[PDB]
Every structure is written in structure tokens, then in C-alpha cells.
């Protein structure tokens, strides 16, 4: 929404840049004007063949006499027009270079200036300007927004003025040569803009319906794949597939309805567009029979108008490129034009010599850019004598850290002044002030250069002697010399990461070369290892003594030797004096001392599509007919102008043009009929395999065991996304792109045959010219992408050192050296600059070549069409036909290179979708094999079970576990932590087979038992019961599948679960909907329902997995009262964390490191004193 003045955007264009654009926009206009003139000459060539075409057939008497006056007229005329043609081709060759080169020259020259001034403005902002802004967005604003500016002031402006030249020059020639046909062509324009307006209303309203259609099926998949362990446990895998298949059945009915309507729309709009043209051209014929226009003049206007009409659309993208570049330049120039109050690039203010370093802080009130929300300093008074070292202590707020911030004048105070020596700090030059102040911060940062270079960031003029003395004076010389490469080592985020105490020592050496008169140490010892702290502290004590120093830290070891100590309380200075005096005061300082002491040939995806042997042959044969039918429109138009040029006696012409225009409209309706078929057939054939694919995938997905659904690769969202994309992508490959790719090869094929058999060597010439200009058009794009990738790699190195400069900004500005990063960034940009200069010459050469190759191709098209061919007996009506048929059939092949990614993006989406079906699990619930025992009573035998989870085979959960529980008794399961309690329930459900050992139920190993039948005797109840969106009667009846559960049967379970108070209180009762879609209820009711579906199964084994986990107050007392009634009649395994409710259990077992540690009845484990005794004691007391 915000934008820029047009002149201010070009403020960096001067002298040559203003001339480059002037000459560039000039030749661009010359480039555009060249095309409608080329069509104007085409009218004069028609009248030359038309006057001879009328007189040659007018004879029917003399023959050798027509070999004289006619051929001489053709000789002088065709040579004149071919001479003019070769001139136009040389014209477009020059202006197209001038157009693109000059504009790319002005663009490259300016963007180089924009980028430097921008980065200069970034480093010029004061710190308070950075505290309110995001540096990451700013650097991306540097590389992205400047790119948008470059796209707007580049050769696009030349293309824009070239297009308006075609538009103006087209309608000028259109108006002058005849004001009638223009107004007739404009009259059909609202119809063409209205038919394409129905498309923007049909696409935008139907693309939501399909995204609404599958969203109902994808909602089923989401709540299923999220509750996968519940449907697996209850075996509803046939139902949840059936529901998904029922929603797929509706999505395909809405998909074929959209295929019917969208193809009716495309054919009808196409028929309205082509009938509009033919009416405007049949109207053109009606004005030649009246001798009002020439047969060649109708072409001259009908083309210059339509060329200039579409020239509007070809200019619209360049308008958006210029406007986006304007608005992109707003926030950029806003930074450049913004002037700071602090500067630091300014050359102003005093530079005192013989600075003695007497600092004082006078009534300083300050607040960080958070402003009126927080005021961290409410008044202040502090002096530090020259030579002295004052230390600042404080409980919190870190107002201690603010004084170091103000001392470098990173901010100016709200009220009050900070005075170095006697002068106010604002009277001294900012850069010189930061140069007389050395800073060592808590987190030290080293830039990605050598040690000597990071030390060289203290002062640019320095020799290895001073570097050596500096690191030796910080006792940092001993440890770097052992490091290889000596001073030439590397540091940074990338490469040679060092100890914290060593990086700080280099920072101390970096600040030591500064030879500052003032020293600021802000928690440099804090957040550092204790051993290396003394090594750095020795350097800090050796760094002072020659300077006045303010030091801030939470280490009260470094504070004793300070001449004065200062305490803060709420931004107010409270206590000050020597260490001993502050202890006698017994105040804030004394208080803190005591406190701290694979693309491949995939045919089988088409073999599954072979379910429909027809519907394809219908579409293909219908598409090939539609392919063979398009050039016949060019054949009609070739003979509408052909018989009109080859007319002779004019009486028969008027009756013939009516016949051709009628046949055209009969060919158009027969084109509509065949287009709708090839669309509907492919559409329906694509929507049905979408159901087959999503059905077989969702079927195979429910086949995999819990081992697969635990994969971090496969989550519910990533599965629903893999489910939708892969099915829609394969539909596109077999869909419209294939019906079109066969319609087009049939379009060129039926066109090349007609053209070849008509003109001998005429077509053979064009078949030598067209492929070359097509290949030359391709190689230009390859060089375009190569230069684009190269320039992206080169400015990346510049923005990389710009990223380093601005992300570590608060450090560099503290060291000044901003001019250093400016020079570094400038040297980095110099390579893309000289690159951008060559880019203009290359871009201009390639564009001019492809334009000239199109215009010279046109001259050879007629100089050969006339002369050698027309001095023979071959005719002009065919040369028009060959031109239209060949060039249109070639532009139809241009759609093959556009639908190419739709094939690869589908084959990759097909690559995954063929494997996701074929993958077979270790435990497949679909296998009908298994024993299915007849004996009812149920035991459970865990024996020597060692189990690790397949996702994390690191820490084992079960190591030699062994349990046994008889029928009808409760097996309590206590554990220190982890799923060692829960893994038992998962292995009994046989979500996994154990690594070693085995687990039995009736004495049979479940590994050889039937998987589905096994889970059919289990009443699983988990922590958070997930209930699908349906009737609570269905969530209850979900406990027993393969049979419809009676209402009184699902009532019995609801009576059993004590949920009947809700089920009768509801208005709908058992038919109420639950799942946070129709109704919402608390977890206590959700659990009771899950208990109901558990015992609707009438299992012989309950499985209660921390059922009272998320519950509270009386809700626990009523749910536990229901669970306690559910057991005592079945085999039961309860791992509930309420050991008070576990006391009345037939056997309590304590799990330890996967092994069973203690076991026995409650009082038995209470008689023993150990883990279980400690478990019951800890939470009964707490
Ligand atoms: Br000769 C000649 C060629 C194309 C003509 O109009 C067009 C044009 Br222009 C493009 C297509 Br596709 C089909 C037809 Br019909 C006319 Br009118 C005359
Ligand atoms: Br230069 C140039 C001129 C006309 C071109 O298209 C044609 C062609 Br090809 C034939 C006829 Br008749 C009219 C037009 Br307009 C092309 Br492509 C390039």
C-alpha cells in the first residue's frame, strides 16, 4: 500500500543513466512500432498477388502473355517488399539490443549504488533504532527488496514502452487504414472479457468446494489416524475404511460434476472467442464485396488491431514490476533518508587530548525503547575518580549494565548528563568517544577472520609486534601459540570453536590495542568456568591500573580490590564506599555477600488405471479428432483469403465466402462437441482412480502395525498430506496434460501433412527455420538461468558479511570499525557490478538475436514463397496455409514443455504411493491365519520378556520381565516410572512382538495366535479416551464389531459404566453426537463411555492404563467406582497411579529396570519394606 515518488526512486540516476533510459526507451518504442508496420507491408504484398490473382484468372485466352506483365509486377513488387522486410529485421536487431542493454546498464549501475547506500544507512542507525526492529527481517529486506527494485528499473521498462508502441502503432494503422473494422473488433471485446470473467467466478468458487469435499473425507482420516491405536485395538479397521470409502464415493460424484461443468465452460468460452473473431473477419469480407476495402487492407487492420489489443496484456506484467519496485523502495529509502541524532559517522564535536578520565553521572533518568512501560533508572548520582576502579553491584534489574550502555553513548539519557572529564559526553565526537573507551562484554564475539584480524578490529593500523604484546599482556599469548597456524587461525560460528575464557582473552586483547583511557567491564567474568576465570581475571587486573574503570559483575571476588563499590536499589544509588565501609553499613551489599557465601518408468500406476479400458480411447480418439480439426480452421481461413485472392471473376466470390464462414461455424460446434468429450472422459477417468488410489492406500495404511505409526517420519498430519497430494498429482498426469499432449501432436501431425503435400520445398524450408528459432529461444533461457544462479551465488557472499556485520552490530559499533564493514561490503559488491555490466550486453545480444531470427525467418518465408516458387506454378493460397498450419502446430507443441513438471511432480508422488501400498508389516491384522481357541477362561503369562521400542532402541524398557495372572483376579502393576508399566498392556494387545522371550494367555503363545481374535478378548481403556464423532451409542457399540450391537446391549454397558445419568439427561439421549463437533463434555463422561465400549465386548481381560490420570475431585471417585465394578469378574491388569485404589488387589507387582522387583498382595508388600512400601508412603503423606 505505501509507495514512492517516481523521481525519488531514480534519484541515483544521473548523466549517463538518464541518457541510457532515454535511448533505451527510444529504441524500445522503435522496437514495438516495427511489428505493425511488418503487418502493413503484408497488406501491400497481398494486393500485389491479388491484382495478378484477378487478372490471371480473368484471361482464359492468352497464356504466354501472362508470363510477362504479371511476372514483371511480381518481380519489382516482391523485391521491394523483401527489401523492406530485410530492413525491418536489421532494425529490430539494433533496437532490441539498445532496448535491453541500456536499461540493464542503468539498472545495474543504480542497484550497485542502492546496495552501498543502504548498507551504509544500516550501520548509521543508533542502537535505540535496532532495539525496536528485527535484524533478520532487515537483512532479508536488504537482499530481497533491492532485488525487487532491480526487477522494476531493468529492461522491463523497455519492454513496457515497446508494448505501448505496438499498442499505439497498432491502433493507429488500424484507424487510418479503416475506422470501421476497429470499432467492430472493439465491440466483441466485452464478450471475450466476459467469458474469461466466468472463469474467475467458476474457478474460485469450485476450487473451494473440492477443498471442502475432501475436507470431509480428510476429517475422517484425521480422527482415524490420530486414534489409530484405538481402532486397531477394537478392530474397526474395516469400518473406518468403509467410512472413508463412503466419503470418497461422494467426492468422486462432486468431482465428475465439476468435470462436466468445467469442460462445458471451457468449450463454450472457446466457441464464443473464435466466433467473435470469425464474425469480425466475415464482417471484413462484407466490406470487400462492397469495394470499400482491399483484401489486403482487411488483413492490415485486422492484424495491427489484434496485435495492439493483445499488446495491452503483454504490458500489464511490466506495470506490476515497476509498481512493486516502487513500494519496495519505500522502506529502503526510508532507511537511507533517515538521519540519526547520534550518528557515529559524523565528523563533529570535540576530540580532547590528555584525557585524564574523571567520569561522573548527574541525575540520569533513562528508559530503554520499551519506553513508558518501564523506567529502569529513577534518578542517579555516581562519580568515579581518575585511575580508580569503581564496581557496581545490584540485586536485579541490571541497572548496573545500563551505565556502561550510556557511557558509550549508545543511548542518550531522558534527563541528566554523563560527563567524561568535565565536558558533557554529547559535545565530544561519537567515534572518538568510542575510541577512548574499551569494552569487554559478558558474551564475547569474534568475527570470521584470523586472530590478528580480530585483534586488528581494535585498530586498523597495527603490526604483529603490537598484536604480540597485546595478547601477551592479556596472557593470551601462551595458549594461541600452541594452536596451529599461529596468529593465522580461524574463528567464528563456523570453524575452530574455542573455550569461553579464551575468546574473552582475545576480546580483552582486542580492546587492549584500542589503548583506551576509559574501560568498561560488564560481567566479563560472569558465565564462565571457574578455572579459566582466574586466568582471565589476571588479565583484567593487568588491563586496568593504567585506566579508569567501571566494572559490573555478580562475582564478588573481583570487587574487593576496587577503590569504590556502588549498590543499586530500584535504579536509585543507595550505598557507596570501600568494601569495609559497606559491611559496616550492613545494607544491600552486605546482604548479597551473605546470600552468595526416484523418477523411473512406473507403468503399473497406469496398469491400475487400466481398470477403465474405455473412457480413455473415447478421449484419445476424440482428442486426435480435435487435433486434426484445428488446422482445418487455418485451412478454411487460408481459402477464405485464398479464393478471395485467387478470385478472378468477382460474381462467384460473394456466394463462396458465405459457404466458408458457415463451414467454419460448423467446424467450431464440432470442435466444441469433441472438446467436452475429451475433457469429461479424462475427468471422470481421473476421479474414479482417485477413489481407487485413496482407498487402497488408506486400506494398506490401516494394515501396518503400531511400529510404523510411531515413526517420527509418519505423523497424522504428514499421513493425511501424503494421502491427498499423491492421489491428486497422479490424476493430473493422466488427466488434461495427456489429452492435450495427444491433441497437439495430432494438431501438428494433421497440419504438417497438409502443408508438406501442398508446397514442395516450401515446407522443407520452414522445417529448417522453425526448429532453429525454437532452439535459439531455448538456449537463451538456459543462459538466462545460468547468469541468474551465478549472480545469486556472488551477492550471497556479500550479504554473508552483511549478515555478520548487522547480527553482531552492537559489538562492532562499540569497536567503531563500521567503515571497515562498509569497505568489506563494497569490495564484495564490485564483482556483481562488473558482472551486471556484462549482463546487459549478453541480455541485449540474445534478445536481439531471437527477434532478428524471427524477422529474417519471415523474409526467407516470402522471398522463397515468391520468386522461385511463384515464378513456378505453385500458388500463394498454399503459402498462407503452410504458414498458419506450421506455426500454429508449433505453438501447440509449446504446451508440451509447460506440462512437463506436472509429469515429474506426479511420478515422484506416484513413487511414494506405489511403495506405501506394497509395504507389508510384521504384525498384519488382515491375515486370517491364527488359531482362534474355543476355551473361554483367560490367563496371562509373561516370561523372560526383553523389549526395546523400535523407534528408540537405546534405553531398554523391559529386560527379562515375567508375570502370571490367573482368571478373575486383578494384577496390579506398580513401576518407578516409564512405560515399563504400560508396555505390558501393549504387548498383550500384541502391538509388538517382544525381542526375546514370549507372552502367553491360555498357555498358547500370542505370537502364533490370531492377532485380531487376540485383541477381541481385551477390554482396553487408556488415559485419554478418544471418541470419534458419532452417536455415543456408536462409540459404545464400537467395542464389538463384526456384529451390530443391540440398543439394550449398549444400554447395559452404559448402565454398567454409570454414565446413564448423562445419557438420559441429554435431549437426544443415546443419539447425541460427541467429538467436539456436535457436543462437548468433560473427561469423566468420556472415560465412562470408553468403559462401556470396553465391556460391550464382554471381554475376558480388562486393561486399565492409568485410567484416572487426567481427573479430579468427585470425578475420580465415581470413575474409580465404575472401574472397581468392572473388574472382579474378569482377568484384569491395572497400572493406575492411585496406590490407594490398588490396596484391594489380588497381586501387586513392582517393576524395576524391566525386571520384576517386588510382588505379592498389598499387606505382603507392606510387610516387606522397600520399593512398594516407599511408593505407598510417599504419596499417602503427600
Ligand atoms: Br491467412 C489467415 C490466417 C489466420 C487467420 O485468423 C486466425 C488466426 Br490470426 C489464428 C488462428 Br489459431 C486461427 C485463425 Br482462422 C486469418 Br482471418 C487469416
Ligand atoms: Br515477423 C512475423 C510476422 C508474422 C507472424 O505470424 C503470421 C504468420 Br506465420 C502468417 C500470417 Br498470414 C500472419 C502472421 Br501475423 C510471425 Br509468427 C512473425
Residue numbers in the entry: 30 to 626, 689 to 1273
Question: Anything the authors wrote about it?
Answer:
The multidrug transporter P-glycoprotein (Pgp)/ABCB1/MDR1 plays an important role in multidrug resistance (MDR) and detoxification owing to its ability to efflux an unusually large and chemically diverse set of substrates. P-glycoprotein (Pgp), a member of the ATP-binding cassette (ABC) superfamily, is one of the most promiscuous drug transporters in nature and is capable of binding and expelling a very large number of substrates from the cell. The structures highlight a high concentration of aromatic residues in the transmembrane α-helices that form the DBP, many of which are directly engaged in contacts with ligands. The binding mode of the environmental pollutant BDE-100 in the DBP of Pgp was also previously captured by XRC and it was shown to be a potent inhibitor of verapamil-stimulated ATPase activity of the transporter.
The site 1 residues present in the Y303A and Y306A mutants but not the F728A mutant were Tyr303 or Tyr306 or Gln721, Ser725, Phe728 and Val731 owing to a rotation of the ligand to form a site that we designate site 1A in the F728A mutant. Phe724 and Phe728 (both on TM7) appear to be important for maintaining the integrity of the canonical BDE-100 site 1, since the mutation of either residue resulted in ligand shifts away from this site. The F728A mutation resulted in an ∼75° rotation of the ligand around TM7 at the pivot point of Ala728 to site 1A that is closer to the pseudosymmetric axis and maintains van der Waals contact between the ligand and TM7 [Figs. 1(d) and Fig. 5]. Despite the rotation of the ligand in the F728A mutant structure, there was sufficient space in the DBP to accommodate the binding of another ligand molecule in site 2. Ligands in sites 1A, 2 and 3 generally exhibited greater disorder compared with those in site 1, as shown by higher B factors in refinement and some smearing of the anomalous electron density. We conclude that Phe974 undergoes an induced fit-like disorder-to-order transition to support the binding of BDE-100 in sites 2 and 3, and this residue is therefore important for polyspecific recognition of the BDE-100 ligand when the primary binding site (site 1) is challenged by mutagenesis. All structures were determined in the 3.98–4.17 Å resolution range and adopted the same inward-facing conformation as wild-type Pgp.
